Design a protein around this ligand. Structure first.
Ligand SMILES: [N]
Ligand SMILES: [N]
Lengths: 388, 6, 383, 6
């Protein structure tokens, strides 16, 4: 399927901010190395009382419609990078766009641009979105994607780890991700359009993240899954993403049930202390955490590079523990909690440890345990590092 | 560094 | 004598170490140069760095429990001070390790061979004083014209010239020439000196003096340039290279003249330059008090914009490198620019607009005015 | 590009 050409050349007047912002967002999804050179262009189709800007690269698709004073309908394809780099510098004045055969004339204020028209006849029609599996608030959706994306793998050689698994079960959604050494799992409530829906797709972490920032503040985002591709839909913006082929491990079983030890401490405090101690670590490889008697003793380094240590008070419960973690991984997790205090759950030094937001129910923990893992909206499991 | 799986 | 033991203020120590580390060598061949020297004496801590070409030193107030010298890793020390909590900073040397305690944070670093560390260069006598902000501004206005190719090291420097109460900075890359002039105070106005300082090193050396203060320049004769301010001392090894005689390059009279708004002209050049092949060329057409910018081709896309200009003389069509053009415009630091052309194949004089250009009726040849700053950009051949 | 020096 290709774009259908009519009998009229596109002529339209636009608002600089609307057209420039639309071209900007639609430009972000352009391919660096186009599978087909045609894909490098942006599609402009004006109809009735609206203008559509579209981009598509056989994997990701982005389409947005904006108000437009249409003088003559039509469709045209032009270089996306030139369109974005031009629309960015256009004066804050009405944008006259007028196609005339092999050339498209973009005149704004005193500036006049003439750009060659591409082979619009060979531009693949972008995919359509499959129904509406439900609606999620934009802010919370983006936050969840943020809290999970940090765990996604970033090695293209390891595609099975680069994906974020989206699980749908009724009015609740569960996002998850892992890089084989850390696991992030978020859960949020949404408005599904069918009561007993059971779905489980895998979306590229980065693409779902960009689609996360897609959606202005205070809006909503409609999701449209199909068996396949996914459909993110934030009001006038309508984007789609092809699903990921690899399989995602069953993270449910990996979540610990109880904890031999638990530790609640302030997020900012612990983060700053970690960053200080990790300065002397070798290529940010390890931080030695020592929990004992309501006091965390952080240390790192050696006489080779330099040894740093920092003590912090902490609400600790259980037998004294000596565990070591990756500094980057630890701070990565602490940044996603978005809570004042963090709660830790340690089984053994060589087994994973839980990092979940701390609640009022952690103001006191009586007994020596083992303690039962509490239900949380977001959890960040992290695999430790072997000590000497 | 240990692993969660594999 | 003994091992250093001192207590210092966090912001004082972090500021001193931060500025001193800015001069540290990226990857020195003599690893000792990668260190920072901490010297505690009487009631002061002297932090310093030196790499045989650039030197940074500063003394801050301190509580010297015991005097001593110690050499530590500048990178690691800087990264530590940068993250130290806003708390008193205790420093205590013991054996071959340095203890840096800040509240609950406790760092322990290895010491470096203090004996192998060379002494810093002695700054010459004060040759003259300049306002720090103005000095940095002038250096910036001329740096844009300096070359960036180590194969031609003579173009990589800034020509500093002193003659009485006047200073003249110059820089060229063989296609542009920036010349700035400024007044300075000197107790010995009989001095006539001319040195060449690496452009980048001169800018970073200008950072020695913060805005709102003075800078004292001390020129030696191996020759080096010394900068002093608010207790900070800096030295830059002079660049051994002959500088081109630049004064005859500047034109004496202009066959054409123009006066435009710097901001609007920059915005227009950046708009029209988007379609030029790799930002290589931009065409200007002057006639009837209207500038017509045009760039690009029919194969890539063409751009054109028309701005009202105060143009005088015979109509002119001349091409420039949009980058060099915007670079010069960014340094004029004035509301309006006044251009001064001869032919499309000869230099053009970008300078701040004066009172006499506004009312420049006639057809020339107009005489070259006088100004504190000139940016002489060589044009590009037109098809 | 013309050269300033000559
Ligand atoms: N494994
Ligand atoms: N030349």
């Amino acid at each position: 399927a290709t774009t259908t050409v009519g009998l009229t050349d596109l002529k339209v007047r636009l608002v600089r901010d609307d057209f420039a912002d639309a071209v900007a967002w639609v430009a972000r999804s352009l391919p660096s190395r186009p599978t087909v050179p045609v894909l490098a262009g942006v599609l402009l189709t004006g109809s009735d009382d609206g203008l559509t800007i579209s981009s598509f690269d056989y994997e990701v698709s982005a389409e947005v419609q904006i108000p437009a004073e249409i003088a003559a309908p039509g469709t045209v394809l032009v270089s996306g990078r030139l369109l974005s780099e031009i629309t960015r510098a256009l004066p804050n004045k009405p944008v006259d766009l007028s196609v005339e055969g092999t050339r498209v004339s973009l005149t704004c204020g005193s500036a006049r641009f003439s750009l060659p028209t591409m082979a619009v006849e060979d531009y693949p029609a972008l995919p359509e979105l499959p129904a509406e599996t439900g609606s999620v608030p934009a802010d919370l959706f983006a936050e969840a994607i943020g809290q999970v994306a940090v765990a996604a793998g970033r090695d293209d050689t390891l595609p099975m780890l680069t994906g974020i698994r989206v699980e749908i079960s009724g009015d609740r959604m569960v996002l998850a991700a892992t890089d084989r050494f850390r696991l992030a799992v978020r859960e949020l409530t949404w408005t599904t359009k069918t009561p007993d829906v059971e779905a489980a797709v895998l979306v590229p972490a980065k693409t779902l993240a960009e689609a996360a920032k897609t959606g202005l503040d205070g809006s909503e985002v409609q999701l449209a899954l199909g068996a396949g591709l996914l459909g993110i839909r934030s009001e006038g913006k309508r984007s789609t993403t092809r699903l990921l082929d690899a399989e995602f491990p069953k993270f449910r079983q990996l979540l610990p049930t109880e904890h031999t030890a638990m530790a609640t401490i302030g997020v900012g405090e612990l983060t700053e202390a970690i960053k200080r101690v990790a300065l002397v670590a070798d290529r940010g490889a390890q931080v030695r955490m020592e929990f004992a008697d309501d006091v965390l003793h952080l240390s790192a380094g050696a006489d080779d590079v330099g040894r740093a240590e920092e003590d912090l008070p902490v609400s600790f419960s259980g037998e004294p523990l000596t565990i070591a973690f990756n500094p980057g991984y630890l701070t990565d997790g602490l940044g996603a909690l978005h809570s004042e205090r963090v709660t830790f759950g340690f089984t053994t030094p060589s087994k994973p440890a839980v990092l979940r937001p701390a609640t009022e129910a952690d103001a006191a923990l009586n007994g020596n345990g083992p303690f039962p893992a509490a239900e949380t909206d977001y959890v960040y499991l992290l695999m430790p590092v072997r000590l000497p | 560094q240990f692993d969660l799986f594999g």
